[PDB]
Amino acid sequence: QSEAEKARKELLELEALSMAVESTGTAKAEAESRAEAARIEGEGSVLQAK
Amino acid sequence: QSEAEKARKELLELEALSMAVESTGTAKAEAESRAEAARIEGEGSVLQAK
């Protein structure tokens, strides 16, 4: 079990990176989809006001 | 049982590291996913206000 835990620490160190990529990708993809829509709506609003 | 406890201390000393990696990786992955989204929303908000 001690040898399994030496190996398991490295697996947990890798899962911490896989979980950071999956979480940041999801959060960034949603936030950037809102930022693009709000910029399109904002640039459109400047012309509509004109 | 005394010989088993000498070996078991080393296993528990290793599990304390595995448990620190699993807990810190989970906490960091969530917090950084919020920090990235809140930065995208903040930089987007500066342009929307402009």
Nearest-neighbour CA in chain A from B5: distance (Å) = 13
Which of A10, A19, A31 shows the shortest CA–CA distance to B18? A10
Tell me how far apart the alpha carbons of residues B25 and A13 are, in angstroms, rounded to a whole number.
Answer: 8
- Rg value, chain B, Cα: 22
CB atoms within 10 A of CB A44: 10
Identity of the residue numbered A11: L
Nearest-neighbour CA in chain A from B22: distance (Å) = 6
Tell me how far apart the alpha carbons of residues A50 and B49 are, in angstroms, rounded to a whole number.
Answer: 17
In the PDB record, what is the listed experimental method?
A: cryo-EM
Provide, as residue numbers in chain A, all residues whose Cβ is less than 8 Å from the Cβ of B12: none
- Which among B3, B8, B13, B48 is the top mutation candidate for probing chain A, defined by the most A β-carbons within 10 Å of its own β-carbon? B48
Helical H segments across B1-50, by residue range: 2-49
Tell me how far apart the alpha carbons of residues B43 and A37 are, in angstroms, rounded to a whole number.
Answer: 14
Tell me how far apart the alpha carbons of residues A27 and B38 are, in angstroms, rounded to a whole number.
Answer: 9
Q: In 3-state terms, what secondary structure has residue B44?
A: helix
**Phi and psi, residue A36, nearest 5°:** -65, -50
Contact A20 B28 (CB under 8 A): yes
